[model samples]
Target: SNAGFQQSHYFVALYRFKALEKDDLDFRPGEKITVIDDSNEESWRGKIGEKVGFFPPNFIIRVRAGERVHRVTRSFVGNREIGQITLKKDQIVVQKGDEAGGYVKVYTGRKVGLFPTDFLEEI
Candidate 1:
């Protein structure tokens, strides 16, 4: 079923800074990073992993059209925290400016939730 989902149905965004711009102390384990998706032209903020500091583009952010707030969870992957409830899916309506976004998830009976780009790296 996953294979049937179109790649266009999913969107991805990444954030990275030049090595020179980063100072030794600037980088840290579990440091927060801000990433804005060019596709959506909206910013989705999250934290970088301890081993990710070396990677200039430390964080990868993702957002899916049918995704619901309940599908989001706390972990190194996915939106670290809900930034703002700016938009909602046609089938579901979330309160604007609600900080509870991470609690919702896409109930399409499939794994249509947002996640870090590297989540599938090993697979």
Candidate 2:
């Protein structure tokens, strides 16, 4: 059989449903999304129960069990600079690495950049 190819992972939803494309999925709170091949960075392939579709990386946070959540406190307008990024209060982002000098590499809006750790809420 094809049992060897079976795989899955858990993720948490950050935003509500708004299908930008036909392959996007809509999920509610407390529902962990099931996904595969999320290595694509921007678009991750997954399923909300029975329906399979694509979703943005920002729309979901990969479940890491004890891993803490992050949210922005100050607003940052992106200028495509190394230290600048687009951030807003309570904006959820995925950390690409550990925090350094009150900053960390975070993935937001399909881009990864340094964000001030001071403006992040440990949510």
Index of the highest-lDDT prediction? 2
Against the true structure, candidate 2 reaches a TM-score of: 0.53
lDDT of 2 by residue, 18-113 (tens): 677887776643346777657897888877768878877667767565444577788876556656577877677767778887678776646678
The stretch of ten residues in a row with the least summed lDDT in candidate 1 is 89-98
lDDT for 102 (candidate 1): 34
> In angstroms, how far off is 121's CA in candidate 2?
1.4
TM for every model, in the order presented, reads 0.18, 0.53
Tens-digit per-residue lDDT, 1-123, candidate 1? 375434433322222233443422133222233332233332232223332223333233233444322222223333435521222222122111222323332322222343332211210
lDDT of 2 at 107: 68
Task: Mark the regions of model 2 whose C-alpha exceeds 4 Å error after superposition.
Answer: 1-9, 18-32, 36-58, 61-68
Q: Which residue pairs in model 1 clash with each other?
A: 69-104, 69-105, 70-103, 70-104, 70-105, 71-104, 71-105
State the displacement of the C-alpha of residue 35, model 1, in Å, after optimal TM-score superposition.
13
- Report, for every candidate in turn, its global Cα lDDT versus the true structure: 0.28, 0.69
Clash tally for model 1: 7
For candidate 2, the lDDT comes to 0.69
